[PDB]
Structure 1
Amino acid sequence: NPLDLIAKRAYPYETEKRDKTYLALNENPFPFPEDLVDEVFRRLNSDALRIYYDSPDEELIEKILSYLDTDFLSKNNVSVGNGADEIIYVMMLMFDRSVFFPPTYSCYRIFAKAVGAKFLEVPLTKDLRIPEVNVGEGDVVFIPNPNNPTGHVFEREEIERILKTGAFVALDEAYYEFHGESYVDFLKKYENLAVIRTFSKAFSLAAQRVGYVVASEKFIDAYNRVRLPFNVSYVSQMFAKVALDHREIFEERTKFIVEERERMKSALREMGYRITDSRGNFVFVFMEKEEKERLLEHLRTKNVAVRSFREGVRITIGKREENDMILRELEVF
């Protein structure tokens, strides 16, 4: 009964009914602009819906390349996924062993167990530094940068130290847009690196699932052989193309989210909370289990959702009134 083994081995699947003020999945506070939804639909060919539509199409790759804005990338350095999740998932199917460093993205462990990958979890140090680990060729090492859930940034030397082991580094730059530095340039020097990106956070397209990966031609070829061939829909691609053609609105939204993040980080410091230097669309607050659970319960009654972790809570940046409500809840507590 293989299905019993999956009950034992893999984590259960659950749908959770969202609270009124939901600040728990690092989603953008803003709806996708209505004008751009309109543009999407006046670009749609109903005759195109009936066919197996190339994933990615050429135009989406040209626009992603234009967004990346390098001198050295070509179309063979870029592919797409059904979310960044798919890219991670597929990478776990590709290598002998997956390595990651708690506190990290919760789906690494989940997907490893889901697909029965060999994996090694070694915790980040007390200072949130990457630990000493025995890794090499055959391994893929998943490093989110900025880190999730801490939002902190690993120094370049840290990433490079792993790169010099020969292990394959999967640099998950899901929160790149809120930080503004990318290690994509390291592809000039290292063949053993892939940078993973998404439209979900900064472009308000989490429901449409478009991720992309930037890597060497050898890797991208291999990835494209292992993934599903028609993995991103015609309309998801069109949403991503239209978003890339109108970046100014998204830049203004990002600017608001970062200013709102830093304002919250300052207020929390002034209150005496121990926080991380987060560079994502969220803040991380350290708290003790007992302080945490009392706060959580209070938020529960006020119809607010944040994300609980072992060492504290991760609060996504929302709208000005939501952010102020959070600060007020933390002040009393």
Structure 2
Amino acid sequence: EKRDKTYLALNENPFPFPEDLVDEVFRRLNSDALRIYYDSPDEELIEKILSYLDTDFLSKNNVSVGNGADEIIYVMMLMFDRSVFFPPTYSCYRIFAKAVGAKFLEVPLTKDLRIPEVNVGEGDVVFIPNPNNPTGHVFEREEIERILKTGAFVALDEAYYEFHGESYVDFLKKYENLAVIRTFSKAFSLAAQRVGYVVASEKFIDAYNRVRLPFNVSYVSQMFAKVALDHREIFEERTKFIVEERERMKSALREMGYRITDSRGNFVFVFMEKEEKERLLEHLRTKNVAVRSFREGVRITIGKREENDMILRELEVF
């Protein structure tokens, strides 16, 4: 419960799915297909995905799909002896591994938000959300190779790719124990239609395809992803801003005297308080505002310009 319009606690894109494309979806959907068991990754869908990644080596067999980016996570943890992530990370990593009955190990990130040091090992799968959530910061070239080199299978959660220039999807030219997970939930405003895709070695995809549900991505959902991909410039325009807006109020918070993460996502992270923030959380609530409460600060999602200025205003009267 509770969403009284001004909600910035789930990294949801502020803009609704373009009405235009909504009309192009079923002006393309056959009412006769709805009755059969529609091919999970659509042969067309993958092709358009390949173009999106715009690489010169991967093919059809290096890409698969999942009911939201969540399913890829959920299933991977089922196919590895142990899942290891580094808090502060995606709160679900913990929830999922606990529901799957999987073996996991949480190792706190360094005070500098650097990757910790611990075991390694083939048979393990370590999740590295990059840019990280909720901090939003980015991991350096080396830190990822560090784990890759241990033999352990790394799972790069690049859900916030769009809001950050590059993605290490080129490590697939040199590593087989890697996988790049992504989604349309944030940059394409399709969070409601659950559509995610992973990218790895051919050995992993079918290995993956054998564990995931046979038909996990609906016919209609699959259309939205294709439609959205053929009008990506539209969304690549919505991003330019979210970034301009983000990196704008970041300077605004640094001004108000707040300590923030060098977030590179569709959100900003205001640090450290707790009973100061558990306080401002009470302040924002009487203002219908809603951010994401964490340990070591709160994470706020970049909404519309009015919502953005909102945050700053209410954040200075504190």
1:125-144 matches, within 5 Å, as 125-144=110-129
The TM-score normalised by the length of structure 1 is: 0.95
Distance between the aligned counterparts of 1:41 and 1:89, measured in 2? 30
Distance between the aligned counterparts of 1:118 and 1:246, measured in 2? 41
Deviations, residues 21-72 of structure 1 (Å, cap 9, x unaligned)? 1000000000000010000010010000000000111000000000000000
Describe the SS at the equivalent of 1:141.
strand
Deviations, residues 225-244 of structure 1 (Å, cap 9, x unaligned)? 00001000000000000000
Distance between the aligned counterparts of 1:18 and 1:327, measured in 2? 20
Distance between the aligned counterparts of 1:300 and 1:271, measured in 2? 21
Distance between the aligned counterparts of 2:109 and 2:3, measured in 1? 31
Question: Could you tell me how far 1:207 is from its partner in structure 2?
Answer: 0.2
Question: Could you tell me how far 1:289 is from its partner in structure 2?
Answer: 1.2
Distance between the aligned counterparts of 2:177 and 2:4, measured in 1? 42
Question: Could you tell me how far 1:103 is from its partner in structure 2?
Answer: 0.3
Distance between the aligned counterparts of 2:256 and 2:10, measured in 1? 25
Distance between the aligned counterparts of 1:289 and 1:306, measured in 2? 13
Q: Which of 90, 94, 100 pairs up with 1:109?
A: 94
Question: Could you tell me how far 1:288 is from its partner in structure 2?
Answer: 1.4
Deviations, residues 187-243 of structure 1 (Å, cap 9, x unaligned)? 000000000000000000000000000000000010000000100000000000000
Question: Could you tell me how far 1:19 is from its partner in structure 2?
Answer: 2.8
Question: Could you tell me how far 1:20 is from its partner in structure 2?
Answer: 2.0
Q: What is the aligned-residue RMSD (CA, Å)? A: 0.6
Distance between the aligned counterparts of 2:26 and 2:284, measured in 1? 39
Question: Could you tell me how far 1:83 is from its partner in structure 2?
Answer: 0.4
Distance between the aligned counterparts of 2:206 and 2:100, measured in 1? 22
* 1:310 and 2:295 aligned: yes
Distance between the aligned counterparts of 1:19 and 1:215, measured in 2? 40
Deviations, residues 237-282 of structure 1 (Å, cap 9, x unaligned)? 0000000000111011001100000011000001110000000000
In structure 2, the residue matched to 1:187 is 172
User: What percent of counterpart residues are identical?
Assistant: 100
Question: Could you tell me how far 1:180 is from its partner in structure 2?
Answer: 1.6
Question: Could you tell me how far 1:74 is from its partner in structure 2?
Answer: 0.4
Distance between the aligned counterparts of 1:277 and 1:310, measured in 2? 17
Question: Could you tell me how far 1:88 is from its partner in structure 2?
Answer: 0.2
Distance between the aligned counterparts of 1:72 and 1:205, measured in 2? 28
Distance between the aligned counterparts of 2:35 and 2:108, measured in 1? 48
The TM-score normalised by the length of structure 2 is: 0.99
Greater helix content? 1
Describe the SS at the equivalent of 2:163.
helix
Moved over 3 A (4+): none
The total of aligned residue pairs comes to 318
Distance between the aligned counterparts of 2:5 and 2:27, measured in 1? 33
Describe the SS at the equivalent of 1:21.
coil
Distance between the aligned counterparts of 1:37 and 1:260, measured in 2? 26
1:285-300 matches, within 5 Å, as 285-300=270-285
Describe the SS at the equivalent of 1:99.
strand
Distance between the aligned counterparts of 1:60 and 1:196, measured in 2? 16
Deviations, residues 281-305 of structure 1 (Å, cap 9, x unaligned)? 0000003111111100010111111
Structure 2 residues not aligned, in runs of 5+: none
Distance between the aligned counterparts of 1:267 and 1:297, measured in 2? 22
Distance between the aligned counterparts of 2:184 and 2:304, measured in 1? 20
Worse-superposed segment, 179-188 or 284-293: 284-293
In structure 2, the residue matched to 1:226 is 211
Deviations, residues 82-134 of structure 1 (Å, cap 9, x unaligned)? 00000000000000000000000000000011111000000100000000010
Structure 1 residues not aligned, in runs of 5+: 1-15
Question: Could you tell me how far 1:17 is from its partner in structure 2?
Answer: 2.2
Question: Could you tell me how far 1:329 is from its partner in structure 2?
Answer: 1.2
